[model samples]
Target: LEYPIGTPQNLAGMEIAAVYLQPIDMEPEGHMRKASESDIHIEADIHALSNNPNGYPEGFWVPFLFIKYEITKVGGSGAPITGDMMAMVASDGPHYGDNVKLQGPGKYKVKYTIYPPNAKENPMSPYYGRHTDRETGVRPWFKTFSVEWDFTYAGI
Candidate 1:
């Protein structure tokens, strides 16, 4: 992921957030988890980009996707990060092992699409959906796909 400012050097101020989903309880555990009556655990690992003065010139930034996801066809709406995906913070920003409540689940799954900022804003801009692939040399960047197991609730 490129910086929002479009700079490729001296990247000493880039902040990256890593997100993960975990069910409250299940056997044979993996990334996918069962929905809880109250909340689902959402974890994040944040990194404040810093230069590794040892020798690495690339600094200490790992390229990651700021994934866009929504729990559609279920009991909520809007972006998961800022919506019903309620973040649990103790002191500062949320760290790992945070919980985001699933609202009275009917059928829930995360639909995610990775894209840069302002990807589909201006019609004439190269970042427009029609010509974004040509401009960035990457195709199908903004397509959404279902991830992990569906959170099914049949009561209890």
Candidate 2:
């Protein structure tokens, strides 16, 4: 089997590739619009290179990651009457989605938090047997990293 993906020296230097909102159909056009009883999606695109610089034969593999979000109805002139929104985003292979219903169109802001995969819960988690010790079960990578945006939901 292939060697487990290379582990970075630390998680500090990871980078943000891009972030945007779109429909579940995932059209070519970027950014999202509209609000209804239906789901809305957003994505936080991230890319990072492994630091396995010195002598390594096959190079390194990229670890699997995911994203979670917290959407807030920022109070403003035309803001919605809803409270804050906190939930895990739905995965669409390469990116993540907010995928939630709107509390009737208005101005809002979304905070997207990127997370490294988890072993205990996520079967696809890259942590696997590598980060876990026999006694500890699983060691969790901190997913405190986040990004955010402000938008106006003009209704469908």
Candidate 3:
């Protein structure tokens, strides 16, 4: 179900460009609050590993230790983040193995923010969020975790 970015859509013999739409909700859901994105940081976490019997995927280190999520900025006209936004996740090492941990029995969403490093001259300066490749200009900043704890039981 993949297509080139600019492929035109021919619907009913009429060519039409793709358009974007937002959800219209009669009732506001969840914790609805308005704040600058810089006010709210982004982060991620992993837990609840389950083994997949089939051949595990490549680049996939383990069957159970898998965590994949996305960070998206909500657009204007609906909900929006109004300022500079940066996110972070704590890690002991590079690989995904050391990253997974249990969060007591609750669904969670990681969140964090960024702040500039204090000194630039230090050789061992923390690149907090550096890119693996040098050709790409990736930098890091200060970030922390903000989480939402769940309330549901295991076998309700």
Candidate 4:
């Protein structure tokens, strides 16, 4: 859990809130460099817009699809940083995140690209399915899209 760094932004069919706090080590833990190697834990909280497709019930975690954080600048800190945000279970539910370095205090700009879920590539795809006959089919996913935001990173 983090103190929300910036106001959550909404676009297309989702809302993304960006937050940061101490770095965290997550399950499939080896998939990430040790949390100590980084300075902060950056997370993207993705939630459904009023018109949620994919059959998620109200207030559900948007599952599967990978998220990438493009930390394009940290004016007074280090150079640009980039990483794929991974999903892991938490007490409240699940979230996508990654360890990031913020070398010094300054304003930083970030872009998060939320991809449409790739059922075939996710190991947990066994839990997902959708009816496809004309009588029950729903809208296909919106094409891939992205959102942006900025935050002030105080030195750690």
- The candidate maximizing TM-score is 4
Q: Rate the local accuracy (lDDT) of all candidates.
A: 0.36, 0.43, 0.23, 0.73
Per-model root-mean-square deviation over C-alphas: 14.3, 10.7, 18.2, 2.8
**TM-score of every model versus the real structure:** 0.29, 0.46, 0.18, 0.83
Off by over 4 Å in 2: 1-11, 17-22, 25-39, 49-63, 76-93, 118-123, 126-143
lDDT tens readout by residue for model 2, 52-125: 22211232322455555666665655433222221223453443333355555666776555555553434356
Q: Candidate 4 at 109: error in angstroms?
A: 0.4
Residue by residue across 21-134, what tens digits does model 4's lDDT show?
A: 777777665776677787888888888777676665555677776787787555454567887888876665688888877656677888887776643434445555567678
- TM-score between candidate 1 and the true structure: 0.29
Tell me the spans in candidate 4 whose CA falls farther than 4 Å from its real position.
Answer: 74-78, 119-129
Q: How much is 69 displaced in model 4, in angstroms?
A: 1.0
lDDT of 3 at 140: 37
lDDT of 2 at 136: 38
lDDT of each residue in 82-154, candidate 3, tens digit only: 2222122122212211111222333232222211232342222453334546665443322322222222211
* Candidate number of the best lDDT: 4
Ranked by lDDT, top first? 4, 2, 1, 3
Output the better candidate (2/4) by lDDT.
4
Candidate 4 yields a Cα-based lDDT of 0.73
